[PDB]
Design a binder for this molecule. Structure first.
Ligand code: XEQ
Lengths: 213, 224, 394
């Protein structure tokens, strides 16, 4: 089983810049590699066949090359249309192997999360469960860490995280973190804290609220 | 024109078998190979097998020998793949693709047309209507000129759900996050940012619509 | 090996290489199989034999440009199939020929078919293999088929002629051609006209390229020494008696084995060291071997030079077949139909004009002073391959 390794799963480039996506086989596949592109919310379409040749309708920007067992797909003028997933292929041996995938994303100036914390509503308390929600909006670099402090105990269980895709208008991100507990446990503690560590600030961004505030 | 129509989504029980279908039209069906591929959310694509509709000669991945059996229907021009003893780890998106020959020969060079995926999901939960909760900013704590509100929906099993603000009119700073799964039930949340002079004056309502169950709830956010 | 293994598998573009190899092998096995049978058919006895080397080569040289232009407007599979369709008829005509004129007619028809197959097969191994190293490897492997055919032809023909009659060497060769046709039908689609997407460079613009003229001259001159020797050999002049079967059976073993070895090694060794170097050192070895030829007292004295020259010839071919496609990619439009007609014309010019011009010259001065001239010409042409180290671009 030949393993096609794609090192970087996320690539960030601005418009009008050259980009290159690399794939590395384990055995010797002799120009038997095809490059496919899948746009967001669509089925994949072929780009490169036989590792050098270009499909009928592919623009002139895409060029495929081989340097032994290392294959490269190069985009000269990255445009807003060239923001998709790209994966390899191999059919020298019969168990087909695809690359893990590389996703292209836009680049912009760094931002800082707008951390907001919402305590459980009245209806949740009546039902019998408590949820504390934390929204972290409008930060560019996709890497962010979130920590929950229940009276400083650093709770770990019951935390659900949802991450938004890159915004179309702003090219920024967003995240939502929910901590759920029984009604009795929420009424026991006093202070709750949602804190974030990001690339734009050494000190964590903390948002805290008191149960009986 | 070549077309490989595919089912939108399939729901199966933790012990069951599912027969995915890919209907081919726009070309002579019995002369091109049809491949099946599986893509788990957040991982690479995995080949499953080939079938030649003319001969019904198939190839399988060694990993998928005991799971997926491919078959064909020449009369109605359809390609079936049956997955048996479905559990988790078997809840990926399955693609049906057509292989092409190089012009003038029978040498394969690319897979031209891929059908849209079929989002197979494995879960034993029955249909349940969601619960909508109006998250509001903390009592007092008046800081800044911008106020963010949100609504949180918990408990609905069938995946699709539509969340709108002020019946879709308010879209200045909306953010709706992907639905997440927990204990065989989904959870979703959304937030909208407005000026400090808007929310205490003009009412904002979160409208949640569930297609599978006839439930439509509008929740009005109020100060604490 | 297994019949089922072909049914359930992607066709891996190596079937095209297999088809090209098989077509070349059969075209060269039919070409040389008549060697043990010529003395049965007998101007001078070395003028009639001279007309058998030239009749096919002249027609192939004349036909090549037309096939080069035709593959542009029709594509390769139809000419490739026509090669088989003419090879089969040529074999049938050979098996039922009762004179010398019919031999000449069959030779000319075989030349037409061979030109079709060679031009449309070399030029298709380049259109599907656009990688430089892969193209070199596959063309070396394909050119190995020519040497294999020349190796296998004469002995198999002689065995079947002495044992099981005169029509046998061709009635068991039509079956192999039929099998090749069946394989071609399995892989290709010779029923559809597929015009090429772009119009290639005119034949009068490629011929003005110095870097294509040099690569064609290397191939043309490398074969000019062995083309003038084979028609004028002692083996033809004598009847098929007094231990003449052995001389006609093993006459072309050394050159064929050397060509096979050299081409197989240097198809892959022509890129580790430059193709210019393989051609440069493949044209001095030819010169030295041709110079050493006229020092042979008896027939055995031609065993060792005919080894070396053969080996050298292989290198040149295995080094300068990919370079034509590479140069047309680097300086011209990527359409290889008419750049391999040039290569085939250069290859066949030696055999077209050898048995006549070489004979006239050898009558004018003498054979040793003809081989000396050919060897010096090759050695002097050798340094011109240095101009293929880094040619410019568009
Ligand atoms: C009876 O007709 C012919 C017979 C023979 C030849 C040509 C003929 O007619 C054109 C040439 C053909 C080649 O290509 C040479 C290849 C070696 C250097 C490996 C050698 N030799 C074989 C015998």
């Amino acid at each position: 089983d030949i393993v096609m390794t794609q090192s970087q799963k996320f690539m960030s480039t601005s418009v009008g810049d050259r980009v290159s996506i690399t794939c590395k086989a384990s055995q010797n596949v002799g120009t038997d590699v095809s490059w496919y592109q899948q746009k967001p919310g669509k089925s994949p379409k072929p780009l490169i066949y036989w590792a050098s040749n270009r499909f009928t309708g592919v623009p002139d920007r895409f060029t495929g090359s081989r340097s032994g067992t290392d294959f490269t797909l190069t985009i000269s003028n990255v445009q807003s249309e060239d923001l998709a997933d790209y994966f390899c292929e191999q059919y020298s041996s019969y168990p087909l192997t695809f690359g893990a995938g590389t996703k292209l994303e836009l680049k912009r100036a760094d931002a800082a999360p707008t951390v907001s914390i919402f305590p459980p509503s009245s209806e949740q308390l009546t039902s019998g469960g408590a949820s504390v929600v934390c929204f972290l909006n409008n930060f560019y670099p996709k890497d962010i860490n979130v920590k929950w402090k229940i009276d400083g105990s650093e709770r770990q269980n019951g935390v659900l995280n949802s991450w938004t895709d890159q915004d179309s208008k702003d090219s920024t991100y967003s995240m939502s973190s929910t901590l759920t507990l029984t009604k009795d446990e929420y009424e026991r503690h006093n202070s709750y804290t949602c804190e974030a560590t990001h690339k734009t600030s050494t000190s964590p961004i903390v948002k805290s609220f008191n149960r009986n505030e | 024109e070549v077309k490989l129509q595919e089912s939108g989504a399939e729901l199966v029980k933790p012990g069951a078998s599912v027969k995915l279908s890919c209907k081919a039209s726009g070309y002579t069906f019995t002369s091109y190979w049809i491949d099946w591929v599986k893509q788990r959310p957040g991982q690479g694509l995995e080949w499953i097998g080939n079938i030649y509709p003319g001969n019904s000669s198939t190839n399988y991945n060694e990993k998928f020998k005991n799971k997926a059996t491919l078959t064909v229907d020449t009369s109605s021009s359809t390609a079936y793949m049956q997955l048996s003893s479905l559990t988790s780890d078997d809840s990926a998106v399955y693609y049906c693709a057509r292989e092409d020959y190089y012009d003038g020969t029978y040498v394969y060079y690319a897979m031209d047309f891929w059908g849209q995926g079929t989002s197979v999901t494995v879960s034993s939960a029955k249909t349940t209507a969601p619960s909508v909760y109006p998250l509001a900013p903390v009592c007092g704590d008046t800081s800044g000129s911008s106020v963010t509100l949100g609504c949180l929906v918990k408990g609905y099993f069938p995946e699709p759900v539509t969340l709108t603000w002020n019946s879709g009119s308010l879209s200045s700073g909306v953010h709706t996050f992907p639905a997440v799964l927990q204990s065989d039930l989904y959870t979703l949340s959304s937030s909208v940012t407005v000026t400090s002079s808007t929310w205490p004056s003009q009412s904002i309502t979160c409208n949640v619509a569930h297609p599978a169950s006839s439930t439509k709830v509008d929740k009005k956010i109020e100060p604490r | 090996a297994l019949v089922r293994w072909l049914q359930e598998s992607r066709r891996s573009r190596k079937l095209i290489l297999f088809i090209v190899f098989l077509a070349l092998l059969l075209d060269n096995m039919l070409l040389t199989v008549v060697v043990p049978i010529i003395p049965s058919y007998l101007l001078n006895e070395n003028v009639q034999v001279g007309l058998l080397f030239a009749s096919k080569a002249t027609v192939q040289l004349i036909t090549n440009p037309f096939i080069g232009l035709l593959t542009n407007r029709i594509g390769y599979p139809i000419p490739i199939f026509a090669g088989f369709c003419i090879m089969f008829v040529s074999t049938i005509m050979f098996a039922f020929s009762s004179s010398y004129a019919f031999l000449l007619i069959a030779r000319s028809l075989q030349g037409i078919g061979s030109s079709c197959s060679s031009v449309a097969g070399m030029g298709m191994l380049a259109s599907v293999y656009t990688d430089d190293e892969e193209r070199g490897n596959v063309m070396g492997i394909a050119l190995g088929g020519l040497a294999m055919g020349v190796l296998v032809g004469p002995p198999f023909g002689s065995v079947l002629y002495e044992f099981v009659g005169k029509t046998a060497p061709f009635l068991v060769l039509a079956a192999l051609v039929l099998l090749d046709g069946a394989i071609q039908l399995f892989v290709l689609q010779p029923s559809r006209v597929q015009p090429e997407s772009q119009k290639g460079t005119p034949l009068t613009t490629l011929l003005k390229d110095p870097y294509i003229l040099i690569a064609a001259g290397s191939i043309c001159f490398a074969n000019m020494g062995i083309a003038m020797l084979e028609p004028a050999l002692p083996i033809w002049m004598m009847e098929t008696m007094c231990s003449r079967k052995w001389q006609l059976g093993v006459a072309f073993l050394p050159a064929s084995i050397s060509y096979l070895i050299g081409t197989n090694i240097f198809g892959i060794l022509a890129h580790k060291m430059g193709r210019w170097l393989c051609a440069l050192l493949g044209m001095i070895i030819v010169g030295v071997s041709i110079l050493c030829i006229p020092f042979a007292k008896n027939i055995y004295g031609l065993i060792a030079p005919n080894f070396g020259v053969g080996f050298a010839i292989g290198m040149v071919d295995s080094s300068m077949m990919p370079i034509m496609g590479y140069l047309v990619d680097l300086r011209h439009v990527s359409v290889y139909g008419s750049v391999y007609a040039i290569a085939d014309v250069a290859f066949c010019m030696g055999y077209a004009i050898g048995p006549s011009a070489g004979g006239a010259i050898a009558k004018a001065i003498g054979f040793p002073w003809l081989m000396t001239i050919i060897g010096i010409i090759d050695i002097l042409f050798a340094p011109l391959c240095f101009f293929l180290r880094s040619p410019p671009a568009k």
